[PDB]
Amino acid sequence: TGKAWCCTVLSAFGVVILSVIAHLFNTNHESFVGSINDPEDGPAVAHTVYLAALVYLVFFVFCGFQVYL
């Protein structure tokens, strides 16, 4: 029902937005670590964003079985 579509679509794009974000701190993209206020260490961040992105893949598959039934 509607209570699962919320966490489904949210977790769906959440995986797709966070995965691209992690790939950019790793590669040291200018817009994300080029300035001084931005964090200095890239891969110290991408290791944190993979993990958080998995958490949304948990709720995408978990509530993905519930809407199926």
Binding site: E30, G34, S35, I36, N37
Partner: protein, 71 residues
Amino acid sequence: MSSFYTVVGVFIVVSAMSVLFWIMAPKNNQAVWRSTVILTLAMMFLMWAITFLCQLHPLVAPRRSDLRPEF
């Protein structure tokens, strides 16, 4: 090659496709196709030319004191 002639180079290519589609459009809901496309290409073109002319000979340049010396 970056100059005002480049805009003119695309004004002709687009003002030619606009004529071939006047011809080749299907009869079924023909004014729907005919006016939709031609009217769309111009407003996609005008927003490209205006976005392009404002970069040729600018009067102010970007300035900042934020980058890292490694760049």
